[model samples]
Target: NKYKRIFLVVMDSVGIGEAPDAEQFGDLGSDTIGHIAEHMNGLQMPNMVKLGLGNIREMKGISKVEKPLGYYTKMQEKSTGKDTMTGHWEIMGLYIDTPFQVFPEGFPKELLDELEEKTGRKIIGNKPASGTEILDELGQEQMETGSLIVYTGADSVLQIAAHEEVVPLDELYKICKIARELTLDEKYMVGRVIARPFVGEPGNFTRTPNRHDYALKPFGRTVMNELKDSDYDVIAIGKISDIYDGEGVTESLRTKSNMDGMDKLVDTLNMDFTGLSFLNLVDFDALFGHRRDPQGYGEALQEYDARLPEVFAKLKEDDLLLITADHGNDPIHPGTDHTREYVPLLAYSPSMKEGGQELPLRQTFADIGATVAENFGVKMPEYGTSFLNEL
Candidate 1:
């Protein structure tokens, strides 16, 4: 039956603990689930814990649960880099313990200087900074002089912020394209070149919703691509379409928000599909995690939890639903960067006779890739071992 379909959901930046290679990666004490719970005055995710999520944690939130819930497993990320692409590529069977590239002191002079010359405008802000805050600080200056606003973050990314009213979207995107072109190699190789356009007056400049990410090509092929090649229908919703550079996705859609992602999810669930349907719920990470808003994080969690029933109702008896996260962004952490942590995986099905269960620990994110490949009766590359048989 080609396994009919598999629904994979990546809860962006919802980490569970620090990775084993934490010190080397500068990610210590990065426990997304634990920190979020502590900040929430004791976070309560009854459904997740029931699925043996507590067992995956070294602490109470990750504490071991008895008799288990669904399939509980603790996955460690091997990639030294913790950006969106690293996590996604690993989940699909590629293992990268080192980083593609980094911009600790902003971009190198060659790239920035080149863009400055090509665009014929002065460039500003070549340091690692936050998108919203950076825009706030340099918004007035960029608008007034019509110069370029360039910034980096704790990620392998180069972000360019500009005012749409001042510089049209096409031109802003052109600048981003130039930056992307300049960052292709080891000297300044980055995962994504983001186009951040804003509007309005100084000290009150607001970034518009037209944010675009030009992610570098995936280091290794993904299950999305593999599945698509095997004649399986692979659909990517939300930023899932963009993150992989649209690789392996036979069908794709852009989502404005989480709710919008859900609407698209609903649409896909009803469509005829035989392979994998992967979704990325990015609002929690992009909006709240980067913004360092704990209250907003908690509220977002609650909102997603409330929508679980809709997911439960949508799954077919023969279908498998895999929910997990790609790294963590601990707002409470010292700097606004992704923390080294374990993402939680909760797999459920209407066909299951019981709820109390446990997943495997000491697994790689590739287990997901393996599962997707296995469902299609195909084999995943030598990346992650399969848990399809376990399920």
Candidate 2:
């Protein structure tokens, strides 16, 4: 079999280096993995080292192996935005010229008025800050005042933070729903309306496990849609389904953490899925990167690396595995937002004869979908040139 199934795992925010046009995105010199490895002295990811992660770029601490075990390269995102939605969409062959609106000064009074009117809660904290930090700053006030802590960031997201005791999970989600509806307008056009639920007292405040993302649907048909239309199974593990608003997935499984996600993949390996198994291990971005924990980020990478043997063992001869990222959330970077950077593309299959093939930088993230489409002899995506023949 040329390729029977493609397991696409997105190591969210695991970027290798700044993109060619990183300055335009205010992300010049940003390197997610490189900076982290340098900060921690060295990253112990032997599994990824063997899999050609270091082969994609010359990093500070990740030395290139003499013979990598996979085909490797870096991919630049063609989409104008550096956020999760844009990056993931480009990977699925849907590039957008117009970026989703961001509210660095917080959502305008007009938008806030509409949201407040709809949700029946006074809005507060309408500035960008870390989710946990914001809660610590305003959680007590919110609990006492019954005001929703609304904020925005460089990413196209409007986050509403509310204490569970004050707003309740139901009420928080409802507020987010109204916000999501309001953001559909052209003036708003937000990418995601996130419900940020937190718990604990003001000083010891901590975010809960009830984070929810209400994402905008894809603008056009992606490769998943094509695969499913051709009667192939398209399984989405983790937030991949939610990010696409359940557009192209046949089965969706919500995962708890990166470790849990890998466990789920190991479980799914014994089952049969003919088309694709798309997984997003988001802990890298959500837990470590956004929190600016370089050591923790490196440790998480090592933890994931430790699980690769089980992953590789489950792969059949016809199975193709792709390890890549959506964008860079550099833990050592200036801000807590995602950076415009080149993501690593590590492609592996049991049938691949050679390793350390320098594939070079790809023009767009759409190449992943293009190559998958080619592997299955399916419809080619409109935006990308396939590297299947090259492999």
Candidate 3:
């Protein structure tokens, strides 16, 4: 293997710009990083800037460096959907022609009836709404009546939020499990069933780190599965394991926030493992992007950029570090749903002899999986062209 370890970190929902088919998704002008940079009068991510983040696109507040430290490019999604699972699955070498079902008007009565019957709890809020807002509107009633506050969003998800004191984490998870099972049917095929556990009083309720996602397993085998079959370690951090429903993951670690996710990634770097360490930092999407808070989004980017040096310092000669994103959730977008946009790709290794190279815009995210498989000399994926030779 050329590189003993490959660290692939997905800065969740950090898209560079709108994709060519953005208009089809009603997201013609969405630019996650660009708008955030403009809103903040420019971003200060020197570590990433050194890695050629600015060179990928014309982002305000980020200047293109004379000598970048890595290879940079943007990747368009070949999958039909612009959601977490679709983006991630494609990154791991799976093509999804049929988009997962989304409940914009909320789930069907038959599905809710089955969930209520199976969980033995009355279901409320069977509509698409923000997780925190829905909790604020109905959390009190859920606490008092011990009812399940089930909700959906723009994405293909069924979230069950409950006050920890009233329903308990275990029971809430059980309800989510039932939801997951019920939604597995053809008619109700949701992407994820989330357990959104909360704590505290009516006006002071807060989501806990105990939030869990029961995701639909990837429809096909990915590079992760092939790597594990070849006796390579596949360490998953944050929601990576949940995104693939623990499929093809050899080890999994959960995190409370984006910073916590980075901390886990750095911790994993200290140990010895010969394979891929996949991490997803979700605070960018969950905290700022969906809330439509560009300032918060910019601040979070700065915070993550400030911490990148630690990870850079820990890199070994044979270690490859890849920074990218699953999709785009533009804070400046009209709606809270993910926008159709291109995600950035940054590749760096201490042993690389070249720097500041601009790679071609990738046709699909599967190119990343192909590159990894090529490096390890493992089974190739159905799609993607390896850029290993260029690196």
| Residue range 68-118, candidate 2, lDDT tens digits | 877888898999888787888889888877677777778888999988787
RMSD of 2: 3.0
Write the number of the candidate with greater lDDT, choosing between 2 and 3. 3
lDDT of each: 0.79, 0.86, 0.91
When summed lDDT is taken over every stretch of 10 residues in candidate 1, the lowest stretch is 58-67
Estimate candidate 2's alpha-carbon lDDT, on a 0 to 1 scale: 0.86
Q: List residue ranges in candidate 2 displaced over 4 A.
A: 101-105, 117-121, 129-147, 152-155, 161-175, 185-187, 195-212
lDDT of 1 by residue, 1-391 (tens): 5358888889899887787777876888777767777777766566555556676664433356675535766677866678788899898878875466767777778887888988887899988877778887888899889998889876677888888988889999988888888887766678888999988887687778899888776777777778877888888998887888988889987898888887888888899888888899998888888778877887787677667667777888788888889888887787677777878887766666665355566467887898778778775667777776666
Ranking by lDDT: 3, 2, 1
- Scored against the true structure, residue 371 in model 2 reaches a CA lDDT of 87
Ranking by TM-score: 3, 2, 1
lDDT at 352 for candidate 3? 68
Query: What TM-score, computed on C-alpha atoms, does each candidate reach?
Result: 0.87, 0.88, 0.89
Candidate 3, number of clashes: 1
Candidate 1 wrong stretches, greater than 4 Å: 58-69, 97-105, 117-120, 128-146, 153-155, 161-174, 197-212, 354-357
Q: How accurate locally is residue 291 in candidate 1, as Cα lDDT from 0 to 100?
A: 77
Best by lDDT: 3
User: For model 2, what is the alpha-carbon lDDT of residue 301?
Assistant: 89
RMSD of every candidate to native, in Å, equals 3.1, 3.0, 2.9
